[PDB]
Amino acid sequence: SGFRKMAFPSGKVEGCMVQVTCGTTTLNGLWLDDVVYCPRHVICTSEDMLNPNYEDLLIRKSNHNFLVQAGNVQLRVIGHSMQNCVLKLKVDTANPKTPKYKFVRIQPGQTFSVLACYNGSPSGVYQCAMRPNFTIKGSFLNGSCGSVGFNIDYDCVSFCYMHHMELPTGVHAGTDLEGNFYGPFVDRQTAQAAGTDTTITVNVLAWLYAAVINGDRWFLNRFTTTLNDFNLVAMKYNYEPLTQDHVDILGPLSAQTGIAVLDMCASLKELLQNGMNGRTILGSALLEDEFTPFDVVRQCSGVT
Amino acid sequence: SGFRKMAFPSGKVEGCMVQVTCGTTTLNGLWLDDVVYCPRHVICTSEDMLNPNYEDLLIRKSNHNFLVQAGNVQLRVIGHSMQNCVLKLKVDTANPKTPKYKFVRIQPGQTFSVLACYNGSPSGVYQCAMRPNFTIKGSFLNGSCGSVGFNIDYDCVSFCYMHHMELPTGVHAGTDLEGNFYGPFVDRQTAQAAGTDTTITVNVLAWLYAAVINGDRWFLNRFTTTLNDFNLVAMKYNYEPLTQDHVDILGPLSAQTGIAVLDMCASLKELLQNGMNGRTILGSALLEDEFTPFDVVRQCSGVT
Ligand SMILES: *CC(=O)N1CCN(Cc2cccs2)CC1
Numbered sequence: 123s124g125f126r127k128m129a130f131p132s133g134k135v136e137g138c139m140v141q142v143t144c145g146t147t148t149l150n151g152l153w154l155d156d157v158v159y160c161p162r163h164v165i166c167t168s169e170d171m172l173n174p175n176y177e178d179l180l181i182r183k184s185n186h187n188f189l190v191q192a193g194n195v196q197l198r199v200i201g202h203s204m205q206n207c208v209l210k211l212k213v214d215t216a217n218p219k220t221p222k223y224k225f226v227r228i229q230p231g232q233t234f235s236v237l238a239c240y241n242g243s244p245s246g247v248y249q250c251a252m253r254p255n256f257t258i259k260g261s262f263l264n265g266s267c268g269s270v271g272f273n274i275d276y277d278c279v280s281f282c283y284m285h286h287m288e289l290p291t292g293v294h295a296g297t298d299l300e301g302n303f304y305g306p307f308v309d310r311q312t313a314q315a316a317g318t319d320t321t322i323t324v325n326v327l328a329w330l331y332a333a334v335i336n337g338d339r340w341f342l343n344r345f346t347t348t349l350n351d352f353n354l355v356a357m358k359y360n361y362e363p364l365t366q367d368h369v370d371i372l373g374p375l376s377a378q379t380g381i382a383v384l385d386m387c388a389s390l391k392e393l394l395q396n397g398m399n400g401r402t403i404l405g406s407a408l409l410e411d412e413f414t415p416f417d418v419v420r421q422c423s424g425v426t
Numbered sequence: 427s428g429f430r431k432m433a434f435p436s437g438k439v440e441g442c443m444v445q446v447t448c449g450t451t452t453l454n455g456l457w458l459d460d461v462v463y464c465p466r467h468v469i470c471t472s473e474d475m476l477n478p479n480y481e482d483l484l485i486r487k488s489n490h491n492f493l494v495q496a497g498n499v500q501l502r503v504i505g506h507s508m509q510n511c512v513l514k515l516k517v518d519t520a521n522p523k524t525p526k527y528k529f530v531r532i533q534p535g536q537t538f539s540v541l542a543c544y545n546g547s548p549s550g551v552y553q554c555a556m557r558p559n560f561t562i563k564g565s566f567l568n569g570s571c572g573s574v575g576f577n578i579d580y581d582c583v584s585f586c587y588m589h590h591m592e593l594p595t596g597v598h599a600g601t602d603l604e605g606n607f608y609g610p611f612v613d614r615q616t617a618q619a620a621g622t623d624t625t626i627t628v629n630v631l632a633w634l635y636a637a638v639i640n641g642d643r644w645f646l647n648r649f650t651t652t653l654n655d656f657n658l659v660a661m662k663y664n665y666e667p668l669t670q671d672h673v674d675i676l677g678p679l680s681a682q683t684g685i686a687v688l689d690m691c692a693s694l695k696e697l698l699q700n701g702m703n704g705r706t707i708l709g710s711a712l713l714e715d716e717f718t719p720f721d722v723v724r725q726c727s728g729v730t
């Protein structure tokens with residue numbers, strides 16, 4: 123029992139982190155097979171970041187300008203290319219610690235673990251979600267760019283995020299490993315505002331199921347609702363509309379607990395309308411939305 | 427920017443986890459050098475757990491009864507002994523992935539990362555604190571016992587916790603790596619109630635400093651207080667008394683922010699007396715107490 127914000131074990135990703143330096147800019151890179159992946163803004167000076175022409179800046183760079191260090195060992199760069207907003211540095215040595223991996227582009231509401239790194243050295247691991255506005259709420263200082271986000275299925279790491287940027291509101295923007303930003307963000311030091319940070323309704327419901335499974339039940343009530351009725355409430359409280367697809371995904375948690383999805387929606391509706399009245403759920407005083415239904419089943423079943 | 431509940435990267439500990447089976451009981455063990463450490467209740471049947479005599483139960487066990495598997499490879503057990511509530515299984519092979527390590531016994535209010543494991547296989551990593559009542563609030567299913575808690579200083583893992591038990595209230599009890607329980611708990615299926623779960627005041631103050639550093643400032647006020655005045659409030663709200671030692675430890679965060687410790691105590695006093703009025707601090711609707719002052723400095727400075 124107990125339910126915690128839990129990250130994937132990070133060792134498989136730790137084995138892939140390197141330092142990349144171009145001129146006097148240092149950030150992190152991801153070494154899989156004989157390619158190192160890093161944000162293309164490694165080629166920029168702070169001056170360049172105002173309005174960079176990355177194709178033009180990259181012409182002035184050679185293989186020998188990209189200093190790639192894996193712990194204390196230098197890697198030999200034998201090619202480089204730009205793919206969207208990432209550079210791919212071909213090195214002469216396959217990473218011997220390369221795990222089974224995939225590159226995935228995640229949808230808003232999906233969760234992933236971040237291995238925050240500085241100078242190719244892991245500092246910490248925490249759990250994130252791709253927000254509906256395509257930001258993430260991370261913990262990233264200067265030098266953390268190129269840190270990645272991932273999920274693990276048994277022995278296969280699915281990399282879904284590489285860190286590129288901070289918005290003035292303190293939320294985070296990155297790319298997938300094809301270098302395509304999540305959302306409308308660009309790797310330029312310009313006016314970029316996040317849209318509405320809407321709450322991931324299907325995740326809140328999953329977490330309420332987690333709460334019941336782990337003994338927190340005070341918020342269960344005598345009510346039910348409908349998807350359309352619930353969605354009137356979701357709209358008012360800047361929650362994502364609940365769809366039958368979301369109901370279908372919560373089916374296993376419904377089955378395990380014997381609480382119909384729409385009955386849990388009626389509990390959530392009352393929590394939205396009445397607040398928590400100074401009470402807590404799984405140690406939280408607000409409605410937690412960064413556990414997916416898959417996360418809840420995993421943590422409640424002990425998958426490795 | 428951003429401030430997240432962050433665990434240590436877990437790879438160094440992942441390399442140490444093994445499965446231990448005695449008869450039909452399977453849990454986790456920690457393989458450092460040529461010793462595997464595990465809870466002594468691995469020798470028990472559920473029957474035995476009511477009132478176990480571990481010295482008497484252990485007489486019926488031989489080296490060959492302890493099945494130790496490191497991934498898919500069996501380890502050869504060449505000795506066993508009991509130290510307090512842990513068994514030490516001597517194996518014929520030093521773990522080649524043994525990190526630099528120490529065994530430390532932590533104090534209440536100290537934080538650590540847990541690598542939750544099942545059948546010697548890591549499932550997840552999360553951050554914990556040793557509570558003032560010597561429980562931890564973890565996420566542990568049957569089979570998770572022997573999962574450990576640790577801190578990392580650069581390249582040295584300090585192991586401070588091994589998981590043994592759940593209290594009926596859903597909080598967790600374990601030992602250090604000498605097998606001595608934190609608090610009054612015993613490895614027996616008996617009436618064990620946790621004492622008051624008091625709030626770790628010095629950690630809340632650290633986290634309020636983290637909040638200011640990361641742009642959350644609404645709770646800063648025009649007031650100051652004294653240690654004795656603040657402590658009258660702490661007593662009323664089941665907070666740990668604040669000492670000059672705690673004030674001294676917050677000195678660096680005081681210095682960095684220019685907010686005197688006793689001024690931050692006056693902010694905390696008003697938050698205790700008035701609540702959050704439906705507002706949040708670093709994404710929390712309650713006062714977070716599982717970041718130490720060292721944690722805040724680390725995450726705010728990007729230590730690896
Ligand atoms: C994440 C990180 O390390 N940094 C330092 C580099 N900096 C480059 C810029 C990208 C867009 C605006 S400036 C980003 C933050």
Ligand SMILES: *CC(=O)N1CCN(Cc2cccs2)CC1
Nearest residue numbers: 467475568569570571613614615
């Ligand atoms: C943590 C874990 O794996 N388990 C299974 C074994 N169980 C033994 C007991 C210890 C005291 C009471 S029963 C503990 C939970």
